[PDB]
Design a protein around this motif. Structure first.
Motif, PDB file in Angstrom:
ATOM      1  N   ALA A   1      10.018   4.128   2.758  1.00 54.56           N
ATOM      2  CA  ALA A   1       9.481   4.412   1.627  1.00 54.56           C
ATOM      3  C   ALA A   1      10.112   2.837   0.164  1.00 54.56           C
ATOM      4  N   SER A   2      11.569   3.112   0.341  1.00 55.04           N
ATOM      5  CA  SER A   2      12.283   2.469  -0.960  1.00 55.04           C
ATOM      6  C   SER A   2      11.976   0.874  -0.890  1.00 55.04           C
ATOM      7  N   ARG A   3      11.857   0.296   0.621  1.00 52.60           N
ATOM      8  CA  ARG A   3      12.116  -1.290   1.231  1.00 52.60           C
ATOM      9  C   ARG A   3      10.330  -1.670   0.375  1.00 52.60           C
ATOM     10  N   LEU A   4       9.302  -0.433   0.349  1.00 51.73           N
ATOM     11  CA  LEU A   4       7.780  -0.833   0.252  1.00 51.73           C
ATOM     12  C   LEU A   4       7.775  -1.008  -1.563  1.00 51.73           C
ATOM     13  N   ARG A   5       9.009   0.214  -2.076  1.00 56.67           N
ATOM     14  CA  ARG A   5       9.126   0.200  -2.889  1.00 56.67           C
ATOM     15  C   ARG A   5       9.769  -1.443  -4.184  1.00 56.67           C
ATOM     16  N   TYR A   6      10.590  -1.952  -3.685  1.00 62.21           N
ATOM     17  CA  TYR A   6      10.432  -3.359  -3.878  1.00 62.21           C
ATOM     18  C   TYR A   6       9.996  -4.192  -3.393  1.00 62.21           C
ATOM     19  N   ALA A   7       9.265  -4.361  -1.702  1.00 63.27           N
ATOM     20  CA  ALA A   7       8.458  -5.405  -1.926  1.00 63.27           C
ATOM     21  C   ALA A   7       7.036  -5.260  -2.911  1.00 63.27           C
ATOM     22  N   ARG A   8       6.670  -4.122  -3.496  1.00 55.06           N
ATOM     23  CA  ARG A   8       5.439  -4.058  -4.345  1.00 55.06           C
ATOM     24  C   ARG A   8       6.111  -5.374  -5.304  1.00 55.06           C
TER      25      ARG A   8
ATOM     26  N   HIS B   1       0.546  -0.508  -3.913  1.00 55.89           N
ATOM     27  CA  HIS B   1      -0.227   0.548  -4.530  1.00 55.89           C
ATOM     28  C   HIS B   1      -0.368   1.837  -3.284  1.00 55.89           C
ATOM     29  N   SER B   2      -1.335   1.714  -2.574  1.00 57.44           N
ATOM     30  CA  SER B   2      -1.943   2.493  -2.427  1.00 57.44           C
ATOM     31  C   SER B   2      -1.062   2.978  -1.743  1.00 57.44           C
ATOM     32  N   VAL B   3       0.271   2.609  -1.133  1.00 58.21           N
ATOM     33  CA  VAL B   3       0.909   3.146   0.232  1.00 58.21           C
ATOM     34  C   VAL B   3       2.053   4.244  -0.674  1.00 58.21           C
ATOM     35  N   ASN B   4       2.280   3.724  -2.022  1.00 60.34           N
ATOM     36  CA  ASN B   4       3.741   3.745  -2.892  1.00 60.34           C
ATOM     37  C   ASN B   4       2.838   4.798  -3.657  1.00 60.34           C
ATOM     38  N   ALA B   5       1.440   4.664  -3.863  1.00 56.41           N
ATOM     39  CA  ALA B   5       1.013   6.415  -4.967  1.00 56.41           C
ATOM     40  C   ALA B   5       1.218   7.511  -3.636  1.00 56.41           C
ATOM     41  N   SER B   6       1.395   7.595  -2.279  1.00 56.08           N
ATOM     42  CA  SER B   6       1.001   8.595  -1.841  1.00 56.08           C
ATOM     43  C   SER B   6       2.436   8.841  -1.703  1.00 56.08           C
ATOM     44  N   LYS B   7       3.236   8.578  -2.374  1.00 61.21           N
ATOM     45  CA  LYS B   7       4.723   9.083  -1.701  1.00 61.21           C
ATOM     46  C   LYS B   7       5.366   9.528  -0.565  1.00 61.21           C
TER      47      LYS B   7
END
Length: 221
Positions: free
Chosen positions: A203-210, A14-20
Motif C-alpha cells: 500500500a505504501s509503495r503504491l502511494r509513492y508510485a502515484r 488513485h482508485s486503488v489508493n483511495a480504497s485504502k
C-alpha cells in the motif's frame, strides 16, 4: 489521452489508493494475484553514467539499451547483433553491428561497454522468472529513495534503493508486479487489490508510485 498511458495509470492508482487497501482487515492479498497479468518486459539491470554518457539498461529478454544524453536511444537485441536506433523524433531505424556503420560507431562502442559492465558486475532483477515490438526507455529520473523508469510501452518501473524492492506497473493490464525483499515476484490486478486489500508495505509503495506517476505527467518534454 496520448501520454504513453500515464493518465490511465494515474487513475488506476488513485482508485486503488483511495480504497485504502491496507486499512481494511480481511486482507486476502493472495486473492488479488492474477497470473494473466504477468509483464512481458521489465528492466533487469541498469547503470547510471548520466553525467557524461547516459543510462544503460538490460531488459529481462537480455536486450540492452542506452538512453544517451542527446536524448537518442540505441538498443541491441538479445542476438547480440540487431540494432534499433531511436532518434529524438521517436522515429526508428534498424541496423546491425556487423555492418560496422560509420554513423553510429561511437554510440555502439558506448553501448557495448555498458553491456559488458552489466554482464560482468550486475545481477538480474527477476532472474528466477520466465516472462509471459521491443520497448525502449522513454524517460527516467531518480529520487533519494528510488529510480523511476518509464518504458515506451507505457510500463513504469520503480526500483527502491533501501530494500531492493521493485514495482512494475502495467496500465494496459491495469496490473502491478511487486518484487519483494526476498526476490519473490508476484503480480496483482489492481482492481482486485481494491477488493481484497493488501499489506501496508505494498500500500505504501503504491502511494509513492502515484506520486512518481504524477511527477512524470508534470514534466513531459
Amino acid at each position: 489521452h496520448m501520454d504513453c498511458h500515464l493518465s490511465d495509470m494515474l487513475q488506476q492508482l488513485h482508485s486503488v489508493n483511495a480504497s485504502k487497501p491496507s486499512e481494511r482487515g480481511l486482507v486476502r492479498q493472495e486473492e488479488a494475484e492474477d497470473p494473466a497479468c504477468i509483464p512481458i518486459f521489465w528492466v533487469s539491470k541498469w547503470v547510471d553514467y548520466s553525467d557524461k554518457y547516459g543510462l544503460g539498461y538490460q531488459l529481462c529478454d537480455n536486450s540492452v539499451g542506452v538512453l544517451f544524453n542527446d536524448s537518442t536511444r540505441l538498443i541491441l537485441y538479445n542476438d547480440g547483433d540487431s540494432l534499433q536506433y531511436i532518434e529524438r523524433d521517436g522515429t526508428e531505424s534498424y541496423l546491425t553491428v556487423s555492418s560496422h556503420p560509420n554513423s553510429l560507431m561511437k554510440k555502439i562502442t558506448l553501448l557495448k561497454y555498458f553491456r559488458n559492465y552489466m554482464s560482468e558486475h550486475l545481477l538480474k532483477a527477476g532472474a528466477n522468472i520466465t516472462p509471459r515490438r521491443l520497448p525502449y526507455l522513454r524517460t527516467w529520473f531518480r529520487t533519494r529513495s528510488a529510480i523511476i523508469l518509464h518504458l515506451s510501452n507505457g510500463s513504469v518501473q520503480i526500483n527502491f534503493f533501501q530494500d531492493h524492492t521493485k514495482l512494475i506497473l502495467c496500465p494496459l493490464m491495469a496490473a502491478v508486479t511487486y518484487i519483494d525483499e526476498k526476490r519473490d515476484f508476484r503480480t496483482y490486478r489492481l482492481s482486485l487489490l481494491e477488493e481484497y486489500g493488501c499489506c501496508k508495505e505494498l500500500a505504501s509503495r503504491l502511494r509513492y508510485a502515484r506520486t512518481m506517476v504524477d511527477k512524470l505527467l508534470s514534466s513531459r518534454s
